[PDB]
Amino acid sequence: ADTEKRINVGKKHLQTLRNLETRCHDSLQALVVIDAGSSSTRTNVFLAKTRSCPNKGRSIDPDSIQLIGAGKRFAGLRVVLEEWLDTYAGKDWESRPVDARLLFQYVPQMHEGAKKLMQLLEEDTVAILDSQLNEKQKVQVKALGIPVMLCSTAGVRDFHEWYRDALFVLLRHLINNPSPAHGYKFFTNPFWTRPITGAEEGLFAFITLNHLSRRLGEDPARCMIDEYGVKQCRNDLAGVVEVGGASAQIVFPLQEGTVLPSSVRAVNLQRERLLPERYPSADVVSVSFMQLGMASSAGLFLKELCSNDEFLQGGICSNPCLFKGFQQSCSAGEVEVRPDGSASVNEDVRKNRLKPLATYCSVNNPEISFKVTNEMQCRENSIDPTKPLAERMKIENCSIIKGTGNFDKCVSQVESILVAPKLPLPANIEAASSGFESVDQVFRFASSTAPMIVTGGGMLAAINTLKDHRLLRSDFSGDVEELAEAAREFCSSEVIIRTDGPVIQLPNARGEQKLNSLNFDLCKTMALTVSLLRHMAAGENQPSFIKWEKSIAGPDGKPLADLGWQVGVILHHVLFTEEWGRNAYEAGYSHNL
Amino acid sequence: GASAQIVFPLQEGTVLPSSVRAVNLQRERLLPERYPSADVVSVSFMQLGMA
Numbered sequence: 001a002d003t004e005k006r007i008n009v010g011k012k013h014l015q016t017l018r019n020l021e022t023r024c025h026d027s028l029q030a031l032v033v034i035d036a037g038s039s040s041t042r043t044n045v046f047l048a049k050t051r052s053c054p055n056k057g058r059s060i061d062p063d064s065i066q067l068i069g070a071g072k073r074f075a076g077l078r079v080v081l082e083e084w085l086d087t088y089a090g091k092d093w094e095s096r097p098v099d100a101r102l103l104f105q106y107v108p109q110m111h112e113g114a115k116k117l118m119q120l121l122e123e124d125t126v127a128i129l130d131s132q133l134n135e136k137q138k139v140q141v142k143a144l145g146i147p148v149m150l151c152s153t154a155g156v157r158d159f160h161e162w163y164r165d166a167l168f169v170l171l172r173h174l175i176n177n178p179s180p181a182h183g184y185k186f187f188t189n190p191f192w193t194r195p196i197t198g199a200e201e202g203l204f205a206f207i208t209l210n211h212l213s214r215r216l217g218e219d220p221a222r223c224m225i226d227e228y229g230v231k232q233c234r235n236d237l238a239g240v241v242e243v244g245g246a247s248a249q250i251v252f253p254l255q256e257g258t259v260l261p262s263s264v265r266a267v268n269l270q271r272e273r274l275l276p277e278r279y280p281s282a283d284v285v286s287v288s289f290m291q292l293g294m295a296s297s298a299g300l301f302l303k304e305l306c307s308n309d310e311f312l313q314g315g316i317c318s319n320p321c322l323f324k325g326f327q328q329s330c331s332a333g334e335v336e337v338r339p340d341g342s343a344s345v346n347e348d349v350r351k352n353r354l355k356p357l358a359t360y361c362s363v364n365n366p367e368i369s370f371k372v373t374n375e376m377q378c379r380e381n382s383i384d385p386t387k388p389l390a391e392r393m394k395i396e397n398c399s400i401i402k403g404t405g406n407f408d409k410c411v412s413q414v415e416s417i418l419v420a421p422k423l424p425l426p427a428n429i430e431a432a433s434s435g436f437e438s439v440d441q442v443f444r445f446a447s448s449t450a451p452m453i454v455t456g457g458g459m460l461a462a463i464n465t466l467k468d469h470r471l472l473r474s475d476f477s478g479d480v481e482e483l484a485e486a487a488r489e490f491c492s493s494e495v496i497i498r499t500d501g502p503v504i505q506l507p508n509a510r511g512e513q514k515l516n517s518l519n520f521d522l523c524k525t526m527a528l529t530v531s532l533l534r535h536m537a538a539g540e541n542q543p544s545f546i547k548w549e550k551s552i553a554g555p556d557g558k559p560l561a562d563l564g565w566q567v568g569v570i571l572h573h574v575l576f577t578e579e580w581g582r583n584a585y586e587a588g589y590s591h592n593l
Numbered sequence: 594g595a596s597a598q599i600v601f602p603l604q605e606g607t608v609l610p611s612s613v614r615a616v617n618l619q620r621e622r623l624l625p626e627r628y629p630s631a632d633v634v635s636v637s638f639m640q641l642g643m644a
């Protein structure tokens with residue numbers, strides 16, 4: 001009588017079915033972050049595990065977030081508006097005054113320009129999904145809808161009329177109207193698709209760093225009892241130094257028991273709605289330096305160095321940050337190292353590395369008339385706001401720039417021009433910003449023992465180049481003198497012209513590498529790094545360690561996602577359970593019909 | 594005698610330059626949330642006091 005066996009099969013069958021209707025169900029979801037930078041617009045495709053629980057709705061497991069594809073670098077959002085202003089306002093718009101009111105006639109023409117770009121991003125996104133997902137995964141991803149987060153960093157923020165915000169209204173209309181033939185349910189809203197500031201970018205990069213490295217989590221790393229008797233809990237978070245194209249961000253946890261001066265403030269991630277209340281309280285020093293971006297620092301450096309009598313003689317600017325044998329036209333225009341060995345300087349106003357700073361330093365537009373010191377800071381850098389744009393960016397009494405390959409002079413000038421200028425640029429007081437004005441002020445008044453991660457392609461190139469030539473050891477841990485001695489050797493290299501093109505030839509027959517558009521001025525980045533490390537060493541509190549990272553390894557050893565602001569943007573929406581459930585699932589793609 | 598203060602309601606729908614900021618009385622915990630929102634321009638100059 002194996003009747004008992006077949007009774008239990010029936011009992012277990014019913015239990016299996018009961019468990020299935022009472023337990024949580026997992027489903028895969030795709031998430032898209034469109035990185036709309038200054039000179040490019042690129043799609044970023046993510047996957048996440050959603051959990052659907054009886055009477056609780058649907059949520060994302062934040063630890064499941066993973067990048068499955070980075071797309072093609074298309075034209076920057078700036079290009080859409082520049083071309084629209086070239087056709088309808090006249091190619092003369094960058095110099096001549098334009099009545100913005102008249103441009104409302106060309107709204108569907110602006111819509112068409114943005115449509116071209118959005119179709120290309122949509123095409124590229126669909127391509128990445130189709131190539132990375134199996135048929136089962138595609139069924140889950142197509143049914144759930146695909147939230148889209150388009151965020152413009154730099155480039156677009158520089159227009160100062162109605163165009164910018166109107167463009168955003170148009171991009172969202174295009175995102176919410178995808179072609180039905182592919183079946184991917186792309187959608188957005190004004191909370192997910194919007195421009196972000198340099199300061200907000202830093203906070204997102206801080207969140208990304210801390211999530212990927214698993215330092216950020218609901219469970220506190222350490223708790224402490226305050227003066228009143230209430231338990232105060234925190235995570236052991238790492239700080240971040242992110243050097244981008246248009247700005248550099250420095251975001252790190254506020255030192256425990258530190259009281260900042262009244263004029264500056266710790267940015268509280270819970271108060272700013274970047275982290276939910278269920279996460280340990282996070283108070284950070286947040287700083288975004290507009291003159292410390294790869295592009296903006298290059299422009300300002302030339303403007304200031306080449307207006308200094310020690311460096312400028314008879315129309316020749318002797319640049320200590322450029323290699324011996326290198327020469328270029330005297331301007332902050334975009335440099336192309338030609339196979340010939342020579343340098344081509346793009347003289348277009350649109351391609352000038354000083355353009356963001358020179359538009360910021362004008363009589364016609366901002367803070368210049370407001371605070372006397374603001375106009376005083378522009379004139380100091382030989383950019384008088386009363387002059388037209390071309391004249392403001394022009395390096396006067398200067399014809400050529402010759403490299404002298406003197407690292408110590410390069411460090412001294414980076415210190416004097418970019419890191420500790422006599423008159424800092426106005427302090428930014430937005431919610432995302434602590435309100436600091438210089439690097440010294442940060443490390444003099446608000447230094448911390450939290451570890452620091454150095455990020456940005458240019459920063460990592462500076463270190464890796466020295467390691468590649470065996471000037472820096474692979475175990476390099478951030479010692480200043482070690483870096484300075486390594487860079488002093490590399491930076492004294494000669495530009496040699498060979499049949500295969502120009503080369504950076506190292507002293508004492510150490511070797512060579514090809515000279516190119518990306519590496520010709522990298523000694524300025526090595527000098528910036530030396531200067532940052534010195535200011536960090538001079539702090540009362542020292543970071544427990546300093547590391548240079550491009551990626552953070554995951555549980556399997558493979559990076560789950562890349563460093564930057566993208567992960568942080570997903571998290572600040574996704575971690576707010578109720579609001580995310582309402583927007584992504586209740587409203588969803590069905591909100592578009 | 595020691596300083597002069599100027600405090601007045603911020604004009605509705607006005608764009609403050611990114612170097613200055615309006616003071617919200619509710620955010621500063623000076624007025625409860627049940628009172629209408631109060632955004633103000635707030636200055637105190639020691640050099641304008643009578644002494």
Ligand SMILES: Nc1ncnc2c1ncn2[C@@H]1O[C@H](COP(=O)(O)O)[C@@H](O)[C@H]1O
Pocket residue numbers: 243244245246294295455456457458459461518519
């Ligand atoms: N290998 C590199 N050498 C020099 N500059 C770079 C390199 N990779 C990226 N950059 C620049 O560094 C900045 C940040 O780059 P990324 O971290 O790749 O967004 C940008 O201005 C890039 O053009």
